[PDB]
Ligand binder design. Structure first.
Ligand code: GTG
Lengths: 137, 74, 148, 732
């Protein structure tokens, strides 16, 4: 494991390449059999790759989550324009924390989308009953 | 494409498709030779199933006539 | 020797020769030794000239039979292409099947063999059965399905 | 069952796993040992197979034969025993390409501590020794060197730790041999003759130059993945073996060796500035990368979808511009001198499948390569151009004929005969045949209209001519009447009895009329030929008749090349005309103006193949009938073989005599009017002769006595002889 920490990550490193980098290291020689060196090598990679995935996509959810929290501070509705909001939040560490402009805009577009709702439901139920009656007739 | 054998005398492919559908979905059916027929399913899952489940079953024609049909993968 | 033998494009399809006489066994024996192919999804206006040009890319063609409306006797949207050798038919099956012929994606299938009467749509209305229930719009096959 | 599971697992390792490869090789290693007691023969078989059929996996399996040798010395000794036996077989059977994969598998085993590093060297020393062998074909001396050099990318590094003394004396005899080889074949195998940008090198020179950069780099390449080279945990203490003294099989009259090759090259790192640097042309990484890619296509050519996937997922040790390597290697195969390893149409759809798999990056590269090919057209070999036209036009028809034609505006103001405009004209002609006239006029810009193909309309002579001063005019008018009336042969014969002069005029009025009344479809013209087939066999009972039919048919359909082709084909198959007549027709003065168009040759080669197929067919029948009334047949089948082969030889004889005649005529005229010999016409004509040799070198070989002493003799212009000598160098 130490042998792999002396190189540059290289998760998809071949065993003969890994063996070439760590061949004179004693933590490498300490394991008696080549098969067990390869098995430790294989498992540590697979556990490091497994962990990079699970880590970089809780940072993803954290970048996105932070960006929304930033937006939540401004009074946005379906009207508001990104052209206008941008110049108001562009300093925040949560805005810069999204490495792209195309995507800060998409996240913004997503974030952007009783009596009157009762009347709308009235119109909907009336149209449904009218369609049913027309079918029956 | 699978084949059918042991169909009723007064039966057609149209009525057969109604029995083969039990497998899932049919694409084409036919009944030639005055006894044997044929069918064409969509996917292999529904096909292989037909030859498995829909095998040596009791076909029921719309003319009140029943019989034993044999399905096979062709 | 090993599984490199894989030839999925040449394998038999699920379709069965409709008005064929023999067993499914007799139809299958013909299909695995055939040199003739069924070609589906052509447009009603796809010509024998176009078919000849595309299918000749996999070997020499012996004959091409255009599918017709049993009653109108006009191009139906399918055809039979017959090669002189099965090796050439296999290659059409391998590299022509699933590609464009006259701007539309076509599908080939092994065919037991041409016989008088196989050129006519068995479609209730004269064309191909396939077109009786089509619920999609196709300007190359006369618009919507027959039941529309 | 078990049998089945072994083969399954042996393949799993090579395939893309979901757990580090080394692990799988670890596991399968034991599993296989555990089964050695009962399944020794099978596992011994399976491995020898994957060794000669899965080269693209070379190092994944060598490792495996190592981990095993590292658990059962006696096993490795048995495997290595088979391999040598398996290798001796491939060699005796002339399956040299398969041998190389074996010879190369052994090589890499040395890196897996299975074969004595010194042992390998002793064998190679014997390979190179072939160069000394007296009175043997160069293609033979060539294969052993190639088998040797092509291995070094794998063995070389460690094979240099030892016997450098002889491993220097070998390079010595090689270098010596490499500088003494004749290179007569190069001009005939090059895709382009222009070396201004990137040179198309002879395969051995290119590889020689490749080894060098590796050697002078201390044999340290950075691509070849190595999954069993790590012997510091297991392979180390393994006990290597010694390959028995290998004495290369004696050259016999039944030996057939691979033909020499020229390396197709169109890309360099500057063609992909913003992409991982591309290994150079003289880097072994280039060789190895294209080798594996070529081998992958060879393993999956029958299934296009699986094929694209194995290519796109190719495992490179260090990143490389994969998409570019994939396109380069596919064109390398399509344009392989005369034709590539597999059926032409396979590359077309294979490329389509690759575009569907990498929608975001493959298409641009494919579009970049098309542009580059077009711009280098001026020196591309005619045989490849044809291949280019057919590929591109067929490709376009799958993408609604969408192309940026203005990018090629430069052709618009060039001699119509120049390669670029001609290429466009031919591509468009091809697009029309895959659709229709009007459609093509609609896809290209107004400025290109001039290059569009003529409307494929019939041209009746005695038709709405109203110009009736023509002979047999009325006779033709009666024919038209009869035909439309369901006339019979004898009736038509009668109508024809009233024709004043083998009667040329009768043929013309018959053909002109019969074809005109069936000009609506191919199927009409066919049945037409079939119905009044008896008339044809009469009027054209002579070669002049046969020749005249072709002449009038061409007069009638000169605007519809596809019609002409299918008719000639149909006529030959129904024996209305024979190949000799077709051959004389091709070189006839009536075709002089269309002599360099594609359809002319597409027809000539289609006639030659029918002849060849015919010969082959009858030979087989005799073969089968001989392997059994049954006699009267073999007596007859013998006679038929005779005639068939005789007519076949005559076809090549006439074709060559005609080529010699028109090429000499050109060479003389020029050498008299002090005019340039290198005209567009000349380019097509000389390269068309070369193509005859390329496409049918196998059959032509049977005529060496006649060709070498009677036709292509010294009194012939060197420009013509050159073509012959290049051909002989293919198996020299
Ligand atoms: C499709 N196909 C046709 N031919 C030949 O071409 C001619 C034209 O007749 P059709 O009139 O094209 O004939 P059928 O296929 O006989 O009947 P059918 O099999 O019932 O089946 C299927 C097409 O119709 C559809 N269909 C059939 N019945 C129903 C139904 O009840 N409901 C719905 N919704 N669809 C149905 C279905 O989707 C299907 O794909 C005939 O001479 C055939 O031999 C084929 N030949 C080969 N080798 N391979 C093929 O795949 C093939």
């Amino acid at each position: 494991k130490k042998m792999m920490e002396e190189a540059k990550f290289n998760p998809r490193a071949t065993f003969s390449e890994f063996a070439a980098k760590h061949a004179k290291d004693s933590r490498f020689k300490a394991i008696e059999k080549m098969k067990d060196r390869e098995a430790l090598f294989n498992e540590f990679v697979a556990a490091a790759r497994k962990k990079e995935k699970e880590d970089s996509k809780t940072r993803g959810e954290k970048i996105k989550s932070d960006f929304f929290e930033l937006l939540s501070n401004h009074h946005l509705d379906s009207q508001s324009r990104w052209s206008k909001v941008k110049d108001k939040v562009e300093s925040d560490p949560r805005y810069k924390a999204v490495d792209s402009s195309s995507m800060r805009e998409d996240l913004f577009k997503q974030y952007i989308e009783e009596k009157e709702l009762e009347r709308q439901a009235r119109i909907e139920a009336s149209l449904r009953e009218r369609e049913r009656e027309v079918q029956k007739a | 494409r699978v084949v059918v054998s042991g169909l009723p005398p007064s039966g057609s492919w149209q009525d057969l498709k109604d029995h083969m559908r039990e497998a899932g979905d049919v694409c084409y059916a036919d009944v030639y030779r005055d006894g044997t027929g044929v069918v064409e399913f969509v996917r292999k899952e529904d096909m292989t199933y037909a030859v498995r489940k829909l095998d040596n079953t009791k076909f029921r024609s719309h003319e009140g006539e029943t019989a034993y049909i044999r399905v096979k993968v062709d | 020797l090993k599984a490199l033998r894989s030839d999925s494009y040449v394998e038999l399809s699920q379709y069965r020769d409709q008005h064929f006489r023999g067993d499914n066994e007799e139809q299958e024996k013909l299909l695995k030794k055939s040199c003739t192919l069924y070609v589906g999804n052509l447009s009603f206006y796809t010509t024998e000239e176009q078919i000849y040009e595309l299918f000749s890319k996999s070997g020499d063609i012996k004959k091409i039979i255009m599918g017709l409306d049993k009653m109108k006797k006009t191009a139906c949207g399918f055809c039979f292409v017959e090669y002189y050798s099965r090796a050439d038919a296999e290659n059409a099956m391998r590299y022509i099947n699933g590609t464009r012929l006259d701007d539309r994606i076509i599908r080939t299938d092994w065919d037991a063999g041409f016989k008088e009467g196989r050129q006519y749509g068995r479609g209730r209305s004269g064309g191909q059965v396939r077109d009786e229930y089509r619920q999609d719009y196709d300007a190359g096959r006369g618009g919507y399905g027959k039941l529309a | 069952e078990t049998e089945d599971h072994l083969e399954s697992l042996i393949c799993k390792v090579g395939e893309k796993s979901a757990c580090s490869l080394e692990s799988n090789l670890e596991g399968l290693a034991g599993v296989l040992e555990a089964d050695l007691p009962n399944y020794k023969s099978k596992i011994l078989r399976l491995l020898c197979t994957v060794a000669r059929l899965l080269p693209e996996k070379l190092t994944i399996y060598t490792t495996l034969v190592g981990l095993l040798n590292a658990r059962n010395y006696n096993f490795g000794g048995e495997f290595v025993e088979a391999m040598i036996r398996q290798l001796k077989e491939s060699l005796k059977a002339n399956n040299y390409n398969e041998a190389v994969y074996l010879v190369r598998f052994l090589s890499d085993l040395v890196n897996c501590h299975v074969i004595a590093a010194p042992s390998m060297v002793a064998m190679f020393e014997n390979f190179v020794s072939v160069t000394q062998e007296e009175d043997v074909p160069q293609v033979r001396r060539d294969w052993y060197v190639y088998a040797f050099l092509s291995s070094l990318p794998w063995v070389g590094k460690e094979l240099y730790e030892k016997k450098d003394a002889e491993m220097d004396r070998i390079f010595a005899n090689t270098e010596s041999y490499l500088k003494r080889r004749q290179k007569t074949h190069v001009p005939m195998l090059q895709v382009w003759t222009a070396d201004k940008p990137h040179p198309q090198e002879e395969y051995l020179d290119c590889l020689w130059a490749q080894i060098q950069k590796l050697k002078k780099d201390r044999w340290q390449e950075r691509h070849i993945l190595r999954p069993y080279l790590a012997f510091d945990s297991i392979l180390c203490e393994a006990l290597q073996h010694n390959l028995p003294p290998f004495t290369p099989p004696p050259h016999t009259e039944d030996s057939v060796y691979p033909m020499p090759r020229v390396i197709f090259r169109m890309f360099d790192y500057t063609d992909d500035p913003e992409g991982p640097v591309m290994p150079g042309s003289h880097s072994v990484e280039r060789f190895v990368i294209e080798e594996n890619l070529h081998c992958i296509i060879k393993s999956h050519w029958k299934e296009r979808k699986t094929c694209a996937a194995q290519l796109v997922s190719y495992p490179g040790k260090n990143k490389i511009p994969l998409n570019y390597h994939i396109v380069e290697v596919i064109f390398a195969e399509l344009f392989q001198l005369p034709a590539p390893p597999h059926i032409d149409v396979m590359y077309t759809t294979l490329l389509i499948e690759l575009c569907k798999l990498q929608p975001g990056s493959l298409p641009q590269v494919l579009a970049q390569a098309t542009e580059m090919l077009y711009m280098r057209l001026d020196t591309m070999n005619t045989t490849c151009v044809d291949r280019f036209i057919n590929w591109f036009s067929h490709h376009l028809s799958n993408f609604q004929f969408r192309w940026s034609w203005e990018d090629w505006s430069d052709c618009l103001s060039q001699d119509p005969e120049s390669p670029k405009p001609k290429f466009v004209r031919e591509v468009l002609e091809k697009c029309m045949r895959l659709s229709y006239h009007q459609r093509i006029l609609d896809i290209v810009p107004p400025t290109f209209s001039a290059l569009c193909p003529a409307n494929p309309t019939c041209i009746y002579k005695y038709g709405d001519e109203s110009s009736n001063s023509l002979p047999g005019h009325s006779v033709a008018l009666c024919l038209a009447v009869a035909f439309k009336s369901k006339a019979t042969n004898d009736e038509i014969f009668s109508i024809l009895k009233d024709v004043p002069n083998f009667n040329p005029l009768k043929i013309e009025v018959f053909v002109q009329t019969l074809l005109h009344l069936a000009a609506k479809s191919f199927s009409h013209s066919f049945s037409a030929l079939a119905k009044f087939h008896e008339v044809f066999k009469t009027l054209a009972e002579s070669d002049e008749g046969k020749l005249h039919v072709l002449r009038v048919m061409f007069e009638v359909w000169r605007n519809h090349p596809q019609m002409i082709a299918v008719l000639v084909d149909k006529m030959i198959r129904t024996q209305i005309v024979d190949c000799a007549a077709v051959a004389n027709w091709i070189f006839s003065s009536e075709l002089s103006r269309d002599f360099t168009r594609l359809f002319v040759w597409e027809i000539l080669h289609s006639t030659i193949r029918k002849m060849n197929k015919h010969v082959l067919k009858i030979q087989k029948e005799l073969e089968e009938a001989k392997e059994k009334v049954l006699e009267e047949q073999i007596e007859r089948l013998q006679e038929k073989v005779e005639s068939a082969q005789s007519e076949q030889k005559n076809l090549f004889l006439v074709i060559f005599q005609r080529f010699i005649m028109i090429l000499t005529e050109h060479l003389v005229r020029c050498e008299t009017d002090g005019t340039s010999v290198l005209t567009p016409w000349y380019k097509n004509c000389i390269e068309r002769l070369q193509q005859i040799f390329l496409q049918h070198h196998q059959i032509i070989q049977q005529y060496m006595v006649t060709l070498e002493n009677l036709l292509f003799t010294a009194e012939l212009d060197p420009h013509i002889l050159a073509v012959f000598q290049q051909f002989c160098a293919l198996q020299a």
